[PDB]
Design an enzyme around this catalytic site. Structure first.
Site, short mmCIF file in Angstrom:
data_model
loop_
_atom_site.label_atom_id
_atom_site.label_comp_id
_atom_site.label_asym_id
_atom_site.label_seq_id
_atom_site.Cartn_x
_atom_site.Cartn_y
_atom_site.Cartn_z
N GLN B 231 0.83 -1.20 0.00
CA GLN B 231 0.00 0.00 0.00
C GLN B 231 0.87 1.26 0.00
O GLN B 231 0.36 2.38 0.01
CB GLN B 231 -0.93 0.02 1.21
CG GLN B 231 -1.97 -1.10 1.22
CD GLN B 231 -2.84 -1.07 2.46
OE1 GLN B 231 -3.06 -2.11 3.07
NE2 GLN B 231 -3.33 0.10 2.83
N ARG B 378 -8.93 -0.46 8.69
CA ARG B 378 -9.66 0.81 8.67
C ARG B 378 -9.65 1.56 10.01
O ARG B 378 -10.68 2.11 10.42
CB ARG B 378 -11.12 0.58 8.24
CG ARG B 378 -11.25 -0.01 6.84
CD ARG B 378 -12.58 0.33 6.18
NE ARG B 378 -13.04 -0.63 5.18
CZ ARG B 378 -13.92 -0.39 4.20
NH1 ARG B 378 -14.45 0.82 4.04
NH2 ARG B 378 -14.30 -1.38 3.41
N1 PCD Z 1 -15.49 13.14 -0.30
C1 PCD Z 1 -15.17 12.02 -0.91
C2 PCD Z 1 -14.26 11.08 -0.33
C3 PCD Z 1 -13.94 9.98 -0.95
N2 PCD Z 1 -14.49 9.69 -2.22
C4 PCD Z 1 -14.02 8.54 -2.96
O1 PCD Z 1 -14.17 7.40 -2.17
C5 PCD Z 1 -12.99 6.52 -2.28
C6 PCD Z 1 -12.38 6.40 -0.89
O2 PCD Z 1 -11.55 7.57 -0.65
P1 PCD Z 1 -10.82 7.89 0.71
O3 PCD Z 1 -11.83 7.99 1.77
O4 PCD Z 1 -10.02 9.08 0.40
O5 PCD Z 1 -9.95 6.63 1.07
P2 PCD Z 1 -8.69 5.95 0.33
O6 PCD Z 1 -7.45 6.59 0.78
O7 PCD Z 1 -8.94 6.00 -1.08
O8 PCD Z 1 -8.81 4.47 0.77
C7 PCD Z 1 -8.19 3.88 1.92
C8 PCD Z 1 -9.19 3.30 2.82
O9 PCD Z 1 -10.08 2.46 2.01
C9 PCD Z 1 -10.83 1.45 2.74
N3 PCD Z 1 -11.73 0.67 1.91
C10 PCD Z 1 -11.22 -0.23 1.07
N4 PCD Z 1 -11.99 -0.58 0.00
C11 PCD Z 1 -11.53 -1.46 -0.85
N5 PCD Z 1 -12.24 -1.84 -1.91
N6 PCD Z 1 -10.28 -2.01 -0.67
C12 PCD Z 1 -9.45 -1.66 0.42
O10 PCD Z 1 -8.34 -2.21 0.51
C13 PCD Z 1 -9.94 -0.77 1.30
N7 PCD Z 1 -9.16 -0.39 2.42
C14 PCD Z 1 -9.84 0.51 3.38
C15 PCD Z 1 -8.84 1.23 4.20
S1 PCD Z 1 -8.07 0.35 5.49
MO1 PCD Z 1 -6.17 1.51 6.12
O11 PCD Z 1 -4.96 0.93 5.03
O12 PCD Z 1 -6.22 0.24 8.02
O13 PCD Z 1 -5.50 2.82 7.07
S2 PCD Z 1 -7.38 3.36 4.90
C16 PCD Z 1 -8.56 2.50 3.94
C17 PCD Z 1 -12.03 7.22 -3.26
O14 PCD Z 1 -12.24 6.72 -4.63
C18 PCD Z 1 -12.50 8.65 -3.22
O15 PCD Z 1 -12.30 9.44 -4.39
C19 PCD Z 1 -15.38 10.61 -2.78
O16 PCD Z 1 -15.88 10.36 -3.91
N8 PCD Z 1 -15.73 11.78 -2.15
#
Ligand code: PCD
Ligand SMILES: Cc1cc2nc3c(=O)[nH]c(=O)nc-3n(C[C@H](O)[C@H](O)[C@H](O)COP(=O)(O)OP(=O)(O)OC[C@H]3O[C@@H](n4cnc5c(N)ncnc54)[C@H](O)[C@@H]3O)c2cc1C
Ligand code: FES
Ligand code: FES
Ligand code: FES
Ligand code: FES
Lengths: 156, 797, 287, 51, 50, 155
Positions: B231, B378
């Site tokens: 990422q 998240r």
């Molecule tokens: N005002 C507003 C805001 C927002 N958006 C859209 O919606 C989406 C989302 O964005 P954001 O809130 O800025 O966020 P990002 O940076 O893109 O993403 C990241 C996140 O994302 C969630 N979800 C999901 N889904 C899917 N399908 N796959 C994945 O892997 C995942 N992972 C998870 C996590 S665990 Mo960390 O790494 O524990 O801190 S942090 C996180 C994009 O297309 C955008 O442009 C809109 O339209 N408007």
């Protein structure tokens, strides 16, 4: 020792020789490069490897390639005809039934068969009928809409 | 023709379909395990069967003799390259391959390289390892006892760590924020005071695609190319460069399509390091792809916070102070993803959506014989824990004062006119309007009628089910960026975007972020579509390739929209300013005699005299006006002035079966406000996914260890993940309170559904027992656990 | 994920499969739907050196009626049970209960015979076969023999079936007109094995219980027939007190294993709960 | 020409030209090397890909 | 050659490497992070080698 | 089709080939040994030169089927354990290549020529490399490349 087999995939004969322990999912992905079907577990729960074998939805990670000598296998790569998306693919597209796309090929192959088993499914029937397929991204809500879309398109 | 031309752009605010879908619905995506390279070998890992112990001997001979096996490596092969240990984002070090001992079950002990994965798996079983078991440490409290065993013998003699002094050998750090003295003073005399202990269980992000990579060192060219589930590919390139000695320009990291990350793929795992090393040694590609059991067992987990919350108030429910103490379980090595100055992330955002004049929090992290992690799934850097703490505490306060749970919140909300609001912890909330949003939700679900129904059921002693109403009003902090405050291993947390307009009008755009399914290839294009008057369909966006994309910090903490979204708009605006200059030259008028209308610059007072972005693009390549370079492109690196603060009001109704203890979610209403909305359809999807994860965490997920340190339920056999049948139908809503400092007023939102829904579920379950004095129940709220509570409170059947 | 090496054999007759079991020995294993065997092999819990696939044997398939007896081939896939117009009319309990087994995909592969032979307390058919009073036909080197479901399960993964035998078919008496039935399965989620389950088949007479069979799922090392629970209803009027008495009799014989589904305390209470629900559901179905 | 310097000092450069054997990958690196004090050996140059 | 040195005091200097890191670590006020450039050259005349 | 077994770069290759298949296409298309190139259809350029049974041969004028039981060496096989062969080092050090199209053939030729004549004069080198054309170098640096390899081989 490798067993020589011919399996029909998407209507095309695939002549290969594989060890008996070769899981169908690896056969498709490794031998034929039909990498649409995916692997998401080792316990048979996810259904990301779902393909259509001899008219039924089957998790290819729990089936031997060598048990398919002469079988008719359908993978996501073979749903579209002459470029035109199958109702099932169109449904997932129009209804935003996919995010990362990993569970998608399995969902499509399952929905393809499900819609033949049940042409006019209720929401409960859809959720239950797709119960063997796990999704981490969608929350399933749009997937049932996608299936409803495809169900409607097939009747028109 | 104006409204139609804007509509045809399918830019900002449009619920346009995804550009990504086409390949995915036809099985043409390109994920790490789809990759096949000439001469590519396969690597598997020999893992620890015990949780703690010395490594007596590793047997390689049987595995090496096996046909198809090319090599078997251990920490001994890594030592000469100084790679048996690697630095982590938390400032600590982690074992790549167990050297003298193992710190957690399933830890990486050795690796085998074979012709394919089948032979490789066989090779792993052939490798025998002899161990000397040592006493295990699974409870954080037991870890800090004087007689507690020494887990990290590598830092024996050290009195300080990366985050301050260390008081015990298993103690990692102690971090705090807010005014301690002021807070203690309020609590010492406040008329109303509540306290509540709560555990935020260790869970796993469990993305459907596990972690893996294809490392390829080319001895001919001398460069390294590795496809990976990362990422933050650019950060990985810098780190891999320094650890390997290979000049950075000759290191290419590429995150292709990723089947979900969910914070699980931010860090570098020993598996990646091993594949890279093996590739360098063998002079050929090495593929590593872990199985589900390995992912849940050894990759980044989330939560695992033991929390003690406290609230001080006056009898009318007005909060006077907040005091929190937490014991953090970080496992064997501290590899917790966070900016270097925040070992507890942004937990000090726990003052919530309330104007609390005095507050203080303290977090103490400790070592245990478990896998590293903490930040993932998240969490927005511990915001999940912060929101859960305050919302549970507010419910506790409301119950002690016998005050309605919605009313007490409306009483403490930061007023709309108070923004930008500086909290007791020093955060400057950008904007908000909580009262309006709360009223909207209460009216939508007919809250008073729900309370009336609940009162009726509680009256009849024989009602077969318990009714609980849960309500959460939260404030998120997303867009980790101010470089003076936030950095990942020294790199300021900015982000970037580069846009190039082609002679014919279309364009290519690359950002330093990396999507894992959230739709960037569609949304990013929409932002640019509106800024430049070019349909989003022909604005091709890409991320993930360190050799082509501008340097960025990746996608996590919902930072893409806040940071990259800003860089994108500013880069486009750099192009728009030049486009105006060019249009003025072509139209033979002054720049400000020009008006921008959707997709063209027209002369004020004369609609017939105009030039479209296509006309301008061609002119830029054909004949640049004097004093301008040919071409039409821009790049912009954005260092954010502040985070973004989206909010939400969540309500859930549950019905608990007194006979079985099973909870049924009757309704779940979710209102989110992330400012200006780029693509509503995409936002809705992120909400559905987030709410579903919340249900997974609060109602079924956990990672229990037995007394021996064995991880139980580490496969989908027991690790809970809902199917379409278990997942309730979500009701979503929204209001639009833009971020004043953001170039397009858009706030992040992706993590909001996860962060907010969890305490909403607990709030609903606990509220179902509230009439019998229950103030809190620890997650997961499974039938079994909920039944134990029904039994304990004589509410069973 | 990766199963160990093994030889694949796919004889076309029960006789030759039995012959292979004999010459290959304990190192060989019959491969039916593979949805228990393969998963165990993939985790290396089981490592047979030979697999004898019995998917190409026609006499192991089919659903027919021999007078008042329904004969289901052992290789009958889970979904075919559900869609069988014969099973639906003669054994509605099996067609409806089968919907509660795993998921659609697994159901297109797992067989009723494999679900029973596997002998896992977690499986649903063992208790179902007891309540329905089924008889299993086994073929070995010495010919065939018919054994009843009641007494077929000996321990966890252990049945009356010998190492050199093959379960050919499952014989079960058709439901008499007005037969009540029910299967109550408490589960954490769809496609999961029961925390507790109860299969009930009963017949009425005016306002009294004339025939009754009660079986318990996953609350002991094997499926259990609640005989004392039946004794609390046979020939007695169907009252609320009678049901509870049965529930108490079912509860008393429970010997659940503690795992992630719950402890003995919870599973036992749940067994009782599933019994109460099954009995009321079964009674409501009587005509 | 587009030049991007990495956090550790090395760099990548791309031009709108396309060598066919005249040695741009070596010579272009030398120009930039003198202009920035970065050894030509780690200034990676590429051409030919319109994307 | 490869560094910026303070006039007079030779011991006070910063290499391009030092500068590159600083550009990513924390950009001086008024500057954007990073260290890169683009340039399109429209030549004033041809070149005449002999 | 004829089943043959060719030893290519030390490894045995048993393949089924059509008689008309030119060795150059067999190497490039079947084995993916794309170092050898094609620059003409008249047998003049020598960009397809490989070593067969101890001799330099233009693989575009030899059939793959004729190689049953042969020992074939291509440019991919010159380096030993990653250490360049003297001829590869000479061409690199003396700037004996530009576009690199004739290089693999030049290297394969030089590899054998230096065994045929270890102490060649400039005239002998030019004559000994006559079967290989180059459009970039003007041959001068190639002569120096071969001279450099000759000195290193007797070192
Ligand atoms: N005002 C507003 C805001 C927002 N958006 C859209 O919606 C989406 C989302 O964005 P954001 O809130 O800025 O966020 P990002 O940076 O893109 O993403 C990241 C996140 O994302 C969630 N979800 C999901 N889904 C899917 N399908 N796959 C994945 O892997 C995942 N992972 C998870 C996590 S665990 Mo960390 O790494 O524990 O801190 S942090 C996180 C994009 O297309 C955008 O442009 C809109 O339209 N408007
Ligand atoms: C994700 C998942 C969920 C599941 N959920 C459930 C559930 O909820 N309820 C449930 O009941 N089951 C469940 N199952 C198991 C399927 O229902 C078990 O598929 C099937 O138990 C074992 O049947 P099988 O036909 O697949 O045979 P196999 O997997 O091949 O196993 C056969 C076993 O019995 C022997 N055997 C098989 N057929 C015969 C025969 N004719 N004669 C003699 N011996 C034979 C084999 O040698 C072996 O020991 C689940 C499986 C999975 C993967
Ligand atoms: S890979 Fe999960 S069910 Fe097949
Ligand atoms: S769309 Fe990502 S798991 Fe389903
Ligand atoms: S291709 Fe010209 S001689 Fe062979
Ligand atoms: S280097 Fe180009 S033809 Fe010889």
């Amino acid at each position: 020792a490798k067993k020589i087999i011919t399996v029909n995939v998407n209507g095309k004969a695939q002549e290969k020789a594989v060890e008996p322990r070769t899981l169908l999912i690896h056969f498709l992905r490794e031998e034929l490069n039909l990498t649409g079907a995916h692997i998401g577990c080792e316990t048979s729960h996810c259904g990301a490897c779902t393909v259509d074998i001899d008219g039924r939805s089957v998790k290819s990670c729990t089936h031997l390639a060598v048990q398919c000598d002469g079988s008719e296998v359908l993978t996501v790569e073979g749903l579209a005809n002459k470029g035109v998306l199958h109702a099932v693919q169109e449904g997932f597209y129009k209804e935003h039934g996919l995010q990362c796309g990993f569970c998608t090929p399995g969902m499509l192959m399952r929905a393809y068969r499900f819609l033949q088993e049940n042409p006019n499914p209720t929401e409960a029937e859809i959720r239950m009928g797709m119960t063997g397929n796990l999704c981490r991204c969608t929350g399933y809500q749009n997937i049932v809409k996608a299936v409803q879309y495809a169900a409607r398109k097939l009747q028109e | 023709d104006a409204e139609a031309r804007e509509l045809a752009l399918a830019g900002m605010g449009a619920s346009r379909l995804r550009k990504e879908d086409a390949r995915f619905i036809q099985g043409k995506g390109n994920y790490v395990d789809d990759i096949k390279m000439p001469g590519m070998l396969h690597m598997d890992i020999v893992r620890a069967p015990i949780a703690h112990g010395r490594i007596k001997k590793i047997h390689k001979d049987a595995a090496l003799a096996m046909p198809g096996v090319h090599a078997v490596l251990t920490a001994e092969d890594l030592k000469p390259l100084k790679l048996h240990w690697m630095p982590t984002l938390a400032g600590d070090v982690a074992a790549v391959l167990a050297d003298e001992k193992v710190h957690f079950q399933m830890q990486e002990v050795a690796i085998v390289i074979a012709d394919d994965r089948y032979i490789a798996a066989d090779a792993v079983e052939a490798v025998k390892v002899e161990y000397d078991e040592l006493p295990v440490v699974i409870d954080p409290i037991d870890a800090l006892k004087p007689d507690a065993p020494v887990l990290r013998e590598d830092l024996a003699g050290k009195t300080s760590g990366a985050h301050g002094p260390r008081e015990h050998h298993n103690h990692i750090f102690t971090w705090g924020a807010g005014d301690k003295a002021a807070t203690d003073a309020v609590f010492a005399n406040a008329p109303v005071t509540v306290s509540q202990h709560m555990y935020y269980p260790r869970v796993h992000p469990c993305p459907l695609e596990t972690c893996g990579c294809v490392a390829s060192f080319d001895p001919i060219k001398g460069d390294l190319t590795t496809y990976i589930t990362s990422q933050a590919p650019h950060v990985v390139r810098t780190v891999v460069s320094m650890l390997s000695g290979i000049p950075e320009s000759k290191v290419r990291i590429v995150s292709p399509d990723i089947g979900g990350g969910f914070g699980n793929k931010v860090g570098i795992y020993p598996g990646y390091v091993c594949a890279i090393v093996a590739s360098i040694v063998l002079g050929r590609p090495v593929k590593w792809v872990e199985d589900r059991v390995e992912n849940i067992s050894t990759t980044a987990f989330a939560r695992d916070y033991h929390m003690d919350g406290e609230l001080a108030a006056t009898p009318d429910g007005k909060i006077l102070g907040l005091r929190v103490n937490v014991v953090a379980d970080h496992g064997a090595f501290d590899a917790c993803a966070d900016p270097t100055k925040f070992p507890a992330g942004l937990f000090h955002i726990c003052s919530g959506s309330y104007d609390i004049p005095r507050a203080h929090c303290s977090v103490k992290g400790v070592y245990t014989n478990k896998a590293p992690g903490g930040v993932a799934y998240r969490c927005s850097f511990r915001v999940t824990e912060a929101v859960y703490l305050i919302e549970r505490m507010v419910d506790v306060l409301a119950q002690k004062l016998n005050m309605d749970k919605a009313e007490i919140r409306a009483k403490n909300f930061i007023r709309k006119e108070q923004f930008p609001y500086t909290t007791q912890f020093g955060f400057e909330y950008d904007s908000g309007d909580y009262h309006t949003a709360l009223k909207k939700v209460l009216d939508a679900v007919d809250y008073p009628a729900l309370r009336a129904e609940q009162a009726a059921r509680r009256a009849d002693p024989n009602s077969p089910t318990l009714m609980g109403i849960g309500l959460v009003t939260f404030t998120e902090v997303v867009g980790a960026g101010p470089s003076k405050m936030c950095d990942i291993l020294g790199v300021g947390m900015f982000d970037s975007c580069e846009i190039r307009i082609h002679p014919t009008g279309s364009a290519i755009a690359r950002m330093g972020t990396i999507t894992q399914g959230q739709g960037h290839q569609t949304t990013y294009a929409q932002i640019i579509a509106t800024e430049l008057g070019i349909p989003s369909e022909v604005i091709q966006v890409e991320e993930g390739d360190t050799s082509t994309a501008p340097y960025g910090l990746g996608t996590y903490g919902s930072r893409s929209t806040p940071v990259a979204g800003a860089a994108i708009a500013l880069a486009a605006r750099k192009i728009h300013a030049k486009a105006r200059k060019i249009a003025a030259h072509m139209l033979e008028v002054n720049e400000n005699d020009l008006d921008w209308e959707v997709d063209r610059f027209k002369v004020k007072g004369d609609d017939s005299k105009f030039k479209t972005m296509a006309d301008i693009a061609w002119q830029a390549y054909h004949q640049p006006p004097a004093g301008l370079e040919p071409g039409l492109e821009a790049v912009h690196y954005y260092d954010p002035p502040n985070f973004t603060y989206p909010f939400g009001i969540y309500l859930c109704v549950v019905d608990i079966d007194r006979a079985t203890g099973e909870t049924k979610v009757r309704r779940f209403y979710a209102l989110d406000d992330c400012g200006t909305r780029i693509n509503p359809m995409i936002i809705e999807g992120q909400i559905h996914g987030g709410l579903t994860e919340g249900y997974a965490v609060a109602m079924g997920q956990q990672m229990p260890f037995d007394a021996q340190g064995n991880l139980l339920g580490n496969t989908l056999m027991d690790y809970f993940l809902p199917t379409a049948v278990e997942t309730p139908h979500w009701e979503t809503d929204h209001t639009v309170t833009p971020s004043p400092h953001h170039p397009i007023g858009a706030k992040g939102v992706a993590e909001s559904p996860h962060v907010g829904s969890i305490p909403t579920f607990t709030a609903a379950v606990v509220d179902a027992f509230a009439h019998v004095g229950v103030t809190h129940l620890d997650m997961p709220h499974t039938s079994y656990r909920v039944w134990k509570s029904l039994k304990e409170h004589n509410l069973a059947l | 994920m990766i199963p160990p090496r093994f030889e694949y054999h796919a004889p076309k007759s029960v006789g030759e499969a039995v012959a292979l079991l004999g010459q290959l020995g304990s190192d060989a294993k019959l491969l039916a739907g593979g949805h228990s065997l393969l998963p165990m092999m993939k985790l290396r819990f089981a490592q047979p050196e030979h697999l004898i696939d019995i998917n190409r044997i026609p006499e192991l398939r089919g659903i027919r009626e021999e007078g008042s007896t329904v004969v289901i081939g052992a290789m009958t896939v889970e979904n075919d049970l559900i869609s069988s117009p014969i099973v639906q009319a003669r054994l509605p309990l099996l067609a409806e209960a089968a919907k509660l087994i795993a998921d659609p995909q697994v159901r297109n592969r797992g067989t009723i015979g494999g679900d029973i032979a596997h002998g896992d307390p977690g499986n649903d058919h063992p208790a179902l076969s007891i309540a329905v009073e089924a008889h299993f036909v086994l073929e070995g080197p010495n010919g065939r023999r018919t054994v009843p479901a009641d007494g077929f399960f000996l321990g966890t993964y252990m049945t009356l079936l010998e190492e050199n035998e093959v379960m050919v078919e499952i014989r079960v008496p058709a439901f008499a007109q007005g037969t009540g039935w029910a299967y109550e399965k408490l589960k954490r989620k769809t496609g999961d094995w029961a925390t507790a389950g109860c299969a009930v088949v009963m017949r009425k007479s005016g306002n009294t219980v004339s025939h009754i069979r009660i079986a318990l799922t996953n609350v002991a090392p094997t499926a259990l027939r609640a005989e004392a629970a039946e004794a609390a209803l046979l020939g007695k009027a169907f009252t609320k007190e009678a049901v509870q008495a049965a529930a108490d009799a079912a509860i008393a014989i429970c010997e659940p294993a503690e795992d992630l589904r719950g402890d003995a305390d919870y599973k036992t209470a749940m067994a009782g709960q599933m019994v109460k629900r099954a009995l009321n559901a079964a009674w409501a179905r009587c005509a």
